[PDB]
mmCIF file of C-alpha atoms in Angstrom:
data_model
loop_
_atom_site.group_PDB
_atom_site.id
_atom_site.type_symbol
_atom_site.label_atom_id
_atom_site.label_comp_id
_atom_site.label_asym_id
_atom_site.label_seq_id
_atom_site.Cartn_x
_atom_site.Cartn_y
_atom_site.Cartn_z
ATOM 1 C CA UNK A 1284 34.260 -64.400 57.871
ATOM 2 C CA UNK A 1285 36.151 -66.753 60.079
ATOM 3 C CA UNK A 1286 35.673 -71.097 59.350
ATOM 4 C CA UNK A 1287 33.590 -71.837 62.444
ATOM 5 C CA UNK A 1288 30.649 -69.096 61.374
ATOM 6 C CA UNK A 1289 30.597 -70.314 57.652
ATOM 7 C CA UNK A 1290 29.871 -73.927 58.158
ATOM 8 C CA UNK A 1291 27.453 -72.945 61.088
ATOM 9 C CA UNK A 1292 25.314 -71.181 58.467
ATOM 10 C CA UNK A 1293 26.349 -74.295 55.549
ATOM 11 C CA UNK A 1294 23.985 -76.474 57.915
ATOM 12 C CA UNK A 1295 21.348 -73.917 58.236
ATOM 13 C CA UNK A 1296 20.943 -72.620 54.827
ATOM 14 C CA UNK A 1297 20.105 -76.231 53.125
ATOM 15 C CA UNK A 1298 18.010 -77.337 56.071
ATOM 16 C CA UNK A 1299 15.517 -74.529 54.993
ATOM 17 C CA UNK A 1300 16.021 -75.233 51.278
ATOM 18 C CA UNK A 1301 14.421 -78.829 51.527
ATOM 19 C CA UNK A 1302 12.032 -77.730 54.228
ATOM 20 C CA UNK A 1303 10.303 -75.073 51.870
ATOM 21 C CA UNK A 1304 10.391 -77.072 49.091
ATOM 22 C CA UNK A 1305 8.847 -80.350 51.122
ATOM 23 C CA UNK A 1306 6.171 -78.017 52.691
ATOM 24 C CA UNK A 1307 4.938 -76.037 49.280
ATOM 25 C CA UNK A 1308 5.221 -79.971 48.155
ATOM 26 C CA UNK A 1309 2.831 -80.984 51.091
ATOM 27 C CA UNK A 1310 0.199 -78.204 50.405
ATOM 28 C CA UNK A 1311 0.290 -79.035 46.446
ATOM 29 C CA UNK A 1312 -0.552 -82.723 46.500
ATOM 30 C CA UNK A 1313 -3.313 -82.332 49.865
ATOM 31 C CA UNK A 1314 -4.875 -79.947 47.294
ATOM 32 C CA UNK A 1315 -4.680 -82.934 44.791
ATOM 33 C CA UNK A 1316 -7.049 -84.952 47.140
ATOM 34 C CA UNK A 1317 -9.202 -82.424 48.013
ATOM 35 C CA UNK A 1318 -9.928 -81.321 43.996
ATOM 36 C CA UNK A 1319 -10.206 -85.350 42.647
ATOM 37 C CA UNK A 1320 -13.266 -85.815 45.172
ATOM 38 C CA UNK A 1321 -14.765 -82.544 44.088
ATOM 39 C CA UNK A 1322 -14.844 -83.151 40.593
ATOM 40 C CA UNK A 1323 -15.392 -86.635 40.675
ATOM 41 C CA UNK A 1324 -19.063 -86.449 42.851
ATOM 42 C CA UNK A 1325 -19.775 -83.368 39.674
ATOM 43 C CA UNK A 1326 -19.002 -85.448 37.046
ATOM 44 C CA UNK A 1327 -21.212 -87.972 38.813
ATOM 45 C CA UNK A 1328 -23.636 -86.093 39.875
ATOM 46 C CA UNK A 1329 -24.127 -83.884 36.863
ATOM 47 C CA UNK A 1330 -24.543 -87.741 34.410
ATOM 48 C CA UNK A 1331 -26.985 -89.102 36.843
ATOM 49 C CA UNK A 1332 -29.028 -86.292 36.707
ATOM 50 C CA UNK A 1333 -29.579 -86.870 33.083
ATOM 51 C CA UNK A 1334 -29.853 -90.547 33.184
ATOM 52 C CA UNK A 1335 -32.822 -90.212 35.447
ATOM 53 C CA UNK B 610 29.477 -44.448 40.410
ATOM 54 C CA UNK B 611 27.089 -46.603 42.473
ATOM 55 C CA UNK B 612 23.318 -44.350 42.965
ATOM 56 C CA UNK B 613 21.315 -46.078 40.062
ATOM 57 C CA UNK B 614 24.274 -48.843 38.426
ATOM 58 C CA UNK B 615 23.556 -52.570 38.347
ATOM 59 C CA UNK B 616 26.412 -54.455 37.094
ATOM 60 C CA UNK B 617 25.854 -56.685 34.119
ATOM 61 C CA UNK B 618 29.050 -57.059 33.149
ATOM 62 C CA UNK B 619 30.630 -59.170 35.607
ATOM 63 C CA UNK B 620 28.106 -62.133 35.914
ATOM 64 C CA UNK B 621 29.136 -65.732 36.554
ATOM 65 C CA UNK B 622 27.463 -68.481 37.468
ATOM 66 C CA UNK B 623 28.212 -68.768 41.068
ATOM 67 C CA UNK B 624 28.819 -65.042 42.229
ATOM 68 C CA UNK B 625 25.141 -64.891 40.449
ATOM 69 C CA UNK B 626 23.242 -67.997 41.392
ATOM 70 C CA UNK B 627 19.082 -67.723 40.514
ATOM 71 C CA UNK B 628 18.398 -70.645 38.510
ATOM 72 C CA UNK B 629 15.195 -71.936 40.304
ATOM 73 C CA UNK B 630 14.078 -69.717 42.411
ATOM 74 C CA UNK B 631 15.210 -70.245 46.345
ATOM 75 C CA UNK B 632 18.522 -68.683 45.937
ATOM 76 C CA UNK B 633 18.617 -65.071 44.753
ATOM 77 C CA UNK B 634 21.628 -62.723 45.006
ATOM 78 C CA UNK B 635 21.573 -59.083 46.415
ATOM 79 C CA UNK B 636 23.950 -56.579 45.870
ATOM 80 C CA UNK B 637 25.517 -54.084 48.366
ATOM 81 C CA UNK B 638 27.170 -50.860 47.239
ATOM 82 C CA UNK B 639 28.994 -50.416 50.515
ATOM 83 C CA UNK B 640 30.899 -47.128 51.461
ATOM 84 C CA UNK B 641 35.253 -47.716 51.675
ATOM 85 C CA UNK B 642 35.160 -47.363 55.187
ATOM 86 C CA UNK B 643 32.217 -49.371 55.487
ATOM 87 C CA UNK B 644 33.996 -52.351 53.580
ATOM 88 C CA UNK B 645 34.845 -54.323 56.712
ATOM 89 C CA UNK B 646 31.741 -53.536 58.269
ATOM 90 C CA UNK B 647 29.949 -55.334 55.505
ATOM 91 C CA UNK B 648 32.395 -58.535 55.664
ATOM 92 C CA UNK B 649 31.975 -58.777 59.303
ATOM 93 C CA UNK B 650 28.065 -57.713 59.170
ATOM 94 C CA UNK B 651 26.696 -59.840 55.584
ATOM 95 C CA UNK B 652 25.599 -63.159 57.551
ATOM 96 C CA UNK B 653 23.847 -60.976 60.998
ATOM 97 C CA UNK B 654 21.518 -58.688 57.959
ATOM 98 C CA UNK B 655 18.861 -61.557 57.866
ATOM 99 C CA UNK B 656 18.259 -65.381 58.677
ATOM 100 C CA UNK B 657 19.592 -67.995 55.537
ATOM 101 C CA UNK B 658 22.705 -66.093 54.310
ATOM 102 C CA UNK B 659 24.967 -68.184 52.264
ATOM 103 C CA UNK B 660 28.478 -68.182 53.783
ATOM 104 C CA UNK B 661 31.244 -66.824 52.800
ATOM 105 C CA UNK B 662 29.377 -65.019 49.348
ATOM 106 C CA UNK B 663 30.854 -61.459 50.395
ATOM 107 C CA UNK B 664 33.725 -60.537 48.255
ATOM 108 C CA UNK B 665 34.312 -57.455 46.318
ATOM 109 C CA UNK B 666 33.154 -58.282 42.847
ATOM 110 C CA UNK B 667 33.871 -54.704 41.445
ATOM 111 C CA UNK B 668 35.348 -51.914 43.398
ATOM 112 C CA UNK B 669 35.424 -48.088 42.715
ATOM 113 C CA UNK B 670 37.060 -45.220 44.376
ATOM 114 C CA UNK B 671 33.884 -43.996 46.651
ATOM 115 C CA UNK B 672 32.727 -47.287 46.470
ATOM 116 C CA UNK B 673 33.408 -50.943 47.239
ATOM 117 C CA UNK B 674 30.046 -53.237 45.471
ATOM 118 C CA UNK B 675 29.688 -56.743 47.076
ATOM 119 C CA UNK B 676 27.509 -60.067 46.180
ATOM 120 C CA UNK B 677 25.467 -61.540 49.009
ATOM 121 C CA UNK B 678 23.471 -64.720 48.453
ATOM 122 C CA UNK B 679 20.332 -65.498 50.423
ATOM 123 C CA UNK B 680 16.863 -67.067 50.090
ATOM 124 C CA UNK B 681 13.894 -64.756 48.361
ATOM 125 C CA UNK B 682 12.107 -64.232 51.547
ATOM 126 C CA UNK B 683 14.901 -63.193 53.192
ATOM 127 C CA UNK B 684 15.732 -60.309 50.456
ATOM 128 C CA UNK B 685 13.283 -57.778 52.657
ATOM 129 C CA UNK B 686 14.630 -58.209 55.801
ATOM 130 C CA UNK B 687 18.331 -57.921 54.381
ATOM 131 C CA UNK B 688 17.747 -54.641 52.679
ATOM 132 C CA UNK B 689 16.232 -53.255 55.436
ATOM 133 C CA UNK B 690 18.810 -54.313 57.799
ATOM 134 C CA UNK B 691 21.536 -53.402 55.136
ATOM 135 C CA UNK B 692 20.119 -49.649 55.558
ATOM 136 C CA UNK B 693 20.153 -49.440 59.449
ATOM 137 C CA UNK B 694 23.883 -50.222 59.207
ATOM 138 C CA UNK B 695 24.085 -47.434 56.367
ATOM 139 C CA UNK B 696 24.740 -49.417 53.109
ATOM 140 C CA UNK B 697 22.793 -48.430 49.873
ATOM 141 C CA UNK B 698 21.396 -51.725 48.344
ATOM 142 C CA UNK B 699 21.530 -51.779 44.819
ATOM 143 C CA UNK B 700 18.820 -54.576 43.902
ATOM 144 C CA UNK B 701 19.756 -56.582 40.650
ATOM 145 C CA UNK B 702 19.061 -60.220 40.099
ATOM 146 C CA UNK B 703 20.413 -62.469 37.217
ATOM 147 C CA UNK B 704 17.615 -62.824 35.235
ATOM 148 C CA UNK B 705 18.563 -63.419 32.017
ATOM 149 C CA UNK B 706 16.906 -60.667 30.255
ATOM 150 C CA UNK B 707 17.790 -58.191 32.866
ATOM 151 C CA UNK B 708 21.588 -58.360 32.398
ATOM 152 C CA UNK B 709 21.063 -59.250 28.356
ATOM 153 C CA UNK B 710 19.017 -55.856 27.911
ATOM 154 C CA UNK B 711 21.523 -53.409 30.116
ATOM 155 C CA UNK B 712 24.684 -54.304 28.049
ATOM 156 C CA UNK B 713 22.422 -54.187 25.080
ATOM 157 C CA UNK B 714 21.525 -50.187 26.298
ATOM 158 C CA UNK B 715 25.275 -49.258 26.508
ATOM 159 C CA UNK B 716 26.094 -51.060 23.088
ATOM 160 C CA UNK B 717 22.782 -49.296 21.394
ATOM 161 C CA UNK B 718 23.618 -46.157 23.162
ATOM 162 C CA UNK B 719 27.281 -46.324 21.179
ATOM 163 C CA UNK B 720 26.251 -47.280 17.984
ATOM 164 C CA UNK B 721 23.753 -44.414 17.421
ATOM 165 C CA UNK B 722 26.145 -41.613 18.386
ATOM 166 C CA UNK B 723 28.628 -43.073 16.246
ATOM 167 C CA UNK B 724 26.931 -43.345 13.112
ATOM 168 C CA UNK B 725 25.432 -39.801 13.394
ATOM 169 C CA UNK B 726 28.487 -37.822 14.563
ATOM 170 C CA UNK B 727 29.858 -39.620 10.985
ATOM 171 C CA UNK B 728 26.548 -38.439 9.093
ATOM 172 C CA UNK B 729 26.413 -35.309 10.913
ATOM 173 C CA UNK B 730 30.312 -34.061 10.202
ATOM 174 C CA UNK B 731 29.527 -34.915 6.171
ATOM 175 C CA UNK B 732 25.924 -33.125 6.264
ATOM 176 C CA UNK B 733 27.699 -30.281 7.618
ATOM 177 C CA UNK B 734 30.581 -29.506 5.378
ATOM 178 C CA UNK B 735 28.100 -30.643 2.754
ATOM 179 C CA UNK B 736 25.779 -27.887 3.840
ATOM 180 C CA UNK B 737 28.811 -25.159 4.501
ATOM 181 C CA UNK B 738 29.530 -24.773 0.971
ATOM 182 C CA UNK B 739 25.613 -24.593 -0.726
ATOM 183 C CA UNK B 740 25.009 -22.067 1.711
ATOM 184 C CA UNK B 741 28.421 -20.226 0.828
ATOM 185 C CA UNK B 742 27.277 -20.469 -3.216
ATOM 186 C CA UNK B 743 24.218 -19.181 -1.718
ATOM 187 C CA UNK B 744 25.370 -16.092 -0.141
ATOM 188 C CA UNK B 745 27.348 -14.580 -2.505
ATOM 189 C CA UNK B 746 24.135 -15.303 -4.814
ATOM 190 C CA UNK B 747 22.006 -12.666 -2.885
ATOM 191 C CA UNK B 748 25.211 -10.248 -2.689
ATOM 192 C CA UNK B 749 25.820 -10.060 -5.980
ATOM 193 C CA UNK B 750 22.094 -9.596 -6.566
ATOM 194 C CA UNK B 751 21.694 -7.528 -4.074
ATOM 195 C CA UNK B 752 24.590 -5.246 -5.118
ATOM 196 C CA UNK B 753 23.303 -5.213 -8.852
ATOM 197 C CA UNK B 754 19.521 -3.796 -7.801
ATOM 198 C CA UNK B 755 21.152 -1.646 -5.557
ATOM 199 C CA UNK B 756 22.878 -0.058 -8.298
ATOM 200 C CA UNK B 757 20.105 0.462 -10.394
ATOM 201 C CA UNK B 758 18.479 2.063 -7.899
ATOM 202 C CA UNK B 759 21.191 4.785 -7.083
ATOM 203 C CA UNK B 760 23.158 5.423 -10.085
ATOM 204 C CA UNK B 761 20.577 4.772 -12.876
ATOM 205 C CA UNK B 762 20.942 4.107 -16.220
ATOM 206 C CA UNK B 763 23.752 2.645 -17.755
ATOM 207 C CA UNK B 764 22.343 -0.798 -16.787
ATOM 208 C CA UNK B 765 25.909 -1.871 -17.646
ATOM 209 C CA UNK B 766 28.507 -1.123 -14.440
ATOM 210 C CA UNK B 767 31.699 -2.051 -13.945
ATOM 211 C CA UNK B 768 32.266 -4.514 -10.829
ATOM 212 C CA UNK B 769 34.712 -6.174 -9.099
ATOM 213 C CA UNK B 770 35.590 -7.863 -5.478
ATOM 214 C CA UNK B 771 38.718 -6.260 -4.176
ATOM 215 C CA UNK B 772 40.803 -8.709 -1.667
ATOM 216 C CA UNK B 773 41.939 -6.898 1.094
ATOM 217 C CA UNK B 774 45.065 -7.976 3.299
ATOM 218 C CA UNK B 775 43.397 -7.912 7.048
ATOM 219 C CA UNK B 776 43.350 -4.957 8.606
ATOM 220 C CA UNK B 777 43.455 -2.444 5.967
ATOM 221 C CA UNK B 778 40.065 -2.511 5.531
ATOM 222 C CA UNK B 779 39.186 0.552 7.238
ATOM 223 C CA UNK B 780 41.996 2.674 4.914
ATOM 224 C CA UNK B 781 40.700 1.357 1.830
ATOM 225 C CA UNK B 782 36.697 2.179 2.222
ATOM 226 C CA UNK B 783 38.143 6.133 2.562
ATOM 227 C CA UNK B 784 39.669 5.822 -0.629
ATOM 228 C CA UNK B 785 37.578 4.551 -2.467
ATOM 229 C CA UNK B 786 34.743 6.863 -0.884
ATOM 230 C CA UNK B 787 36.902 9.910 -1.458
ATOM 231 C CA UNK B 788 37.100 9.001 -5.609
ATOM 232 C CA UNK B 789 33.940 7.805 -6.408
ATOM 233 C CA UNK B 790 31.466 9.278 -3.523
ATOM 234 C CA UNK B 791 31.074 12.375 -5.709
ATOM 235 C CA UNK B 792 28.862 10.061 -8.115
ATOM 236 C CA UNK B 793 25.982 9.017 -5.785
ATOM 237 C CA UNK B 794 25.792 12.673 -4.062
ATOM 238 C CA UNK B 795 27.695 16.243 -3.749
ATOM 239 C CA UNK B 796 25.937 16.615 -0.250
ATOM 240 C CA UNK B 797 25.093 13.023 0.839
ATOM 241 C CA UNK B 798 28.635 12.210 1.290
ATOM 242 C CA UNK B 799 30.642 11.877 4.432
ATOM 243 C CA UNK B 800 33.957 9.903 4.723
ATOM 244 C CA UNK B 801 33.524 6.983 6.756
ATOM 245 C CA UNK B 802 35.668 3.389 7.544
ATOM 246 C CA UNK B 803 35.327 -0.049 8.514
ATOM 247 C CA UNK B 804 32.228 -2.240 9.336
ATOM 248 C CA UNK B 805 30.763 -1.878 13.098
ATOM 249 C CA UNK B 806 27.692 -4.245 13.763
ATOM 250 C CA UNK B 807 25.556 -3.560 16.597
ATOM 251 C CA UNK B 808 21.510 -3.270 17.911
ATOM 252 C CA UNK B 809 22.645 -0.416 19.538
ATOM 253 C CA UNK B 810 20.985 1.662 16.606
ATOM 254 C CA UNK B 811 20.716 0.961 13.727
ATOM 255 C CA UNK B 812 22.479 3.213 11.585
ATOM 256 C CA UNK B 813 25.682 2.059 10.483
ATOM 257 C CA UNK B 814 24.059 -1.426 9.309
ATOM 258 C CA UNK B 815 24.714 -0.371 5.636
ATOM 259 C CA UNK B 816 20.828 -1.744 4.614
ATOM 260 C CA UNK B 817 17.487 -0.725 2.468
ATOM 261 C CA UNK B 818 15.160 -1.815 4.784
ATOM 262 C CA UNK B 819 16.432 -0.263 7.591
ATOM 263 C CA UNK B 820 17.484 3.135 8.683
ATOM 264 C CA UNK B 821 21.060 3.622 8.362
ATOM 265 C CA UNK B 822 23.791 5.852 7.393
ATOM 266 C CA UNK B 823 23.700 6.159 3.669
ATOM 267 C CA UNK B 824 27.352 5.365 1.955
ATOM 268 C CA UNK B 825 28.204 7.821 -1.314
ATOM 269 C CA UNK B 826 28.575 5.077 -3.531
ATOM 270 C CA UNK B 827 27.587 1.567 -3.745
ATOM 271 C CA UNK B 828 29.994 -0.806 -1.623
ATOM 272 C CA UNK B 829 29.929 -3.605 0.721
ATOM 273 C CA UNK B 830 31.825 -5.212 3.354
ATOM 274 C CA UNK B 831 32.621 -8.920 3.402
ATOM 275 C CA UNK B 832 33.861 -10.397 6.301
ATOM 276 C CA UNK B 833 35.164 -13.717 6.978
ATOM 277 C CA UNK C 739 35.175 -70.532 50.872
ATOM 278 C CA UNK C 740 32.817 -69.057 48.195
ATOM 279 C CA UNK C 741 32.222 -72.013 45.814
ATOM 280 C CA UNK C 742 32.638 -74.316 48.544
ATOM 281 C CA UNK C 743 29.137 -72.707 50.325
ATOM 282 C CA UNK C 744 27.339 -71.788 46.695
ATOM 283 C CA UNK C 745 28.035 -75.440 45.669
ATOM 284 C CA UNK C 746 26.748 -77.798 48.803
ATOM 285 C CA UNK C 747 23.473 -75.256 48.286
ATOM 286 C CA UNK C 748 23.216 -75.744 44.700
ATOM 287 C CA UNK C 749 23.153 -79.528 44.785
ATOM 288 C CA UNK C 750 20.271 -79.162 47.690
ATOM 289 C CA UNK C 751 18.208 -76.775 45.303
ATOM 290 C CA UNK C 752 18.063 -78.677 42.699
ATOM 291 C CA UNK C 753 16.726 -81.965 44.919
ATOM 292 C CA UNK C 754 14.476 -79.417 46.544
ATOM 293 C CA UNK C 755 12.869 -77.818 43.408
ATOM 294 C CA UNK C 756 12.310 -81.514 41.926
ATOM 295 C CA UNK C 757 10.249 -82.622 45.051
ATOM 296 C CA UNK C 758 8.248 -79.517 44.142
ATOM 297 C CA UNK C 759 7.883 -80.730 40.638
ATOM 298 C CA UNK C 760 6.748 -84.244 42.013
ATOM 299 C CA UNK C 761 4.033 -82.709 43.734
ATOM 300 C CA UNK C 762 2.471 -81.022 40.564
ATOM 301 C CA UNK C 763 2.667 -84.170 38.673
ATOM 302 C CA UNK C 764 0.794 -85.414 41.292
ATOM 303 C CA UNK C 765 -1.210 -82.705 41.346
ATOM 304 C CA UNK C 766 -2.398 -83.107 37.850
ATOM 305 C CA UNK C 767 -2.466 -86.817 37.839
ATOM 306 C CA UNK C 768 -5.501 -87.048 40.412
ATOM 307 C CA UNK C 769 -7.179 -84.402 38.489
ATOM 308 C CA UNK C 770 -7.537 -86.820 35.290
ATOM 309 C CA UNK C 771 -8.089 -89.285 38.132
ATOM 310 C CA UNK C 772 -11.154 -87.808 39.069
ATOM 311 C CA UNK C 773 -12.179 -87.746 35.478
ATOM 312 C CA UNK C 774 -11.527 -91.676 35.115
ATOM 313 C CA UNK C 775 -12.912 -93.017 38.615
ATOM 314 C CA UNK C 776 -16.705 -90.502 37.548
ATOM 315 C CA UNK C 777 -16.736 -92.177 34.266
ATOM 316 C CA UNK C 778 -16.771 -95.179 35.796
ATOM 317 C CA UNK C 779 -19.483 -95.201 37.954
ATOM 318 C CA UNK C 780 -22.079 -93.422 35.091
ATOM 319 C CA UNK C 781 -22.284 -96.213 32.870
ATOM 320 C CA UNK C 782 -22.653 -98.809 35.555
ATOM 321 C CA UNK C 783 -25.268 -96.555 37.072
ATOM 322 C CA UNK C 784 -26.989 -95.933 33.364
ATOM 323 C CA UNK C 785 -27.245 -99.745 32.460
ATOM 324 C CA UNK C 786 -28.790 -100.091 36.199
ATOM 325 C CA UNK C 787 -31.679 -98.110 34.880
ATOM 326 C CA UNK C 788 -31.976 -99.770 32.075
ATOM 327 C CA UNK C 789 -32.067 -103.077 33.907
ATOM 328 C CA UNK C 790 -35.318 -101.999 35.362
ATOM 329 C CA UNK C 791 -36.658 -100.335 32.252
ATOM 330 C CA UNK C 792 -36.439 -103.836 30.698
ATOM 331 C CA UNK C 793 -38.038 -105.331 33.469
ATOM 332 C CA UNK C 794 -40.663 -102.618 33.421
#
């Protein structure tokens, strides 16, 4: 197709590229927070317990 | 013929980009007519088409197969669209594997005919002649028994295998019934020619275990 | 036009598929991270009760 219509969808096309790769990257380390408290009041928890 | 192809033959690196996993290609087996429909259509099918990726990669009478590129997501809302505009999709990605193990089934697929057809032309000219020892085995036995059983004693006969120029067949089983058809009956002889085969009846089959006309003498027909 | 489009997209999924790979280092970073900062507060918390003990 015709040089106006293939640069219109150039822009486009890596504009979503980043975008899906910066939001899967967004969900992936907000996980990363959510799992190190988790585990790390277990771990505590779990010790402490046997301590007392 | 595009209905059930995937091309595997005519990957590159760039006409067949899937290397991560954002990019993926599709392929279009588009109708001739259809052809410019496609080249004006590829970007509209879904959102995130790569530009400019239709071109005719391979091309067939019928037939004219492009290479779209797009994003994964994307891939069910192009097919779909790609059917409303009445394409075929022909879904093949460029996995390694995929296109390794195709060309592998059309390579596999030539090597086992060939070395059989090899095998199997020996094995039978092999077999032709075993089975030709073989026949003339049973004749000849089958001819000596025979002979006991109609003519008697002397166990000692005099035999021999006539060649006959084709088509003369027929005049020399009458002569040779004529002479010797006195020996094996006075009553039980008619003259007769040639061989007939047939499940018609089964007289005329020349046999001991079936019912068939009964020759005056011991003598049988060879054929090849 | 076809390896003028295929390569401008190439370059950005390669950049995009590493930011992804960041995130997974990351990821499993804060899970041995959680491992590290617990350990740390059970034997400060043990030798507290044995502080007490001793006093006992």
């Amino acid at each position: 197709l015709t040089p106006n219509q293939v640069n219109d969808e150039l822009n486009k096309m890596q504009a979503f590229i980043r975008k899906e790769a910066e939001e899967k990257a967004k969900e992936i380390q907000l996980k990363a927070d959510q799992e190190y408290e988790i585990e790390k009041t277990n771990i505590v928890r779990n010790e402490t317990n046997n301590i007392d | 013929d595009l209905s059930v192809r995937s091309l595997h033959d005519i990957v590159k690196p760039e006409d067949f980009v899937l290397n991560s996993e954002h990019l993926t290609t599709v392929l279009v087996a588009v109708p001739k007519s259809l052809k410019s429909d496609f080249e004006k259509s590829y970007e509209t099918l879904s959102k995130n088409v790569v530009p400019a990726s239709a071109s005719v990669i391979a091309e067939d009478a019928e037939y004219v197969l492009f290479n779209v590129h797009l994003f994964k997501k994307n891939v069910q809302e192009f097919t779909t669209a790609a059917r409303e505009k009445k394409f075929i999709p022909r879904e093949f990605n460029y996995s390694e594997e995929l296109i390794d193990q195709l060309k592998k089934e059309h390579d596999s697929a030539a090597s086992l005919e060939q070395s059989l057809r090899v095998q199997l032309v020996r094995l039978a000219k092999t077999a032709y002649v075993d089975v030709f020892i073989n026949w003339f085995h049973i004749k000849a036995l089958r001819v000596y028994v025979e002979s006991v059983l109609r003519y008697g004693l002397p166990p000692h006969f005099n035999i021999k295998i006539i060649a006959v120029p084709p088509k003369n067949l027929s005049k020399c089983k009458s002569e040779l019934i004529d002479a010797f058809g006195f020996l094996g009956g006075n009553a039980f002889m008619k003259d007769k020619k040639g061989k007939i085969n047939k499940q018609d009846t089964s007289l005329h089959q020349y046999a001991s275990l079936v019912d068939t006309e009964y020759e005056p003498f011991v003598m049988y027909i060879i054929n090849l | 036009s076809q390896k003028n489009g295929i390569a401008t997209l190439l370059q950005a999924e390669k950049e995009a598929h590493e930011i992804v790979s960041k995130a997974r280092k990351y990821r499993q970073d804060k899970l041995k991270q959680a491992k590290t900062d617990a350990a740390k507060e059970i034997d400060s918390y043990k030798i507290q009760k044995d502080k007490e003990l001793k006093e006992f």
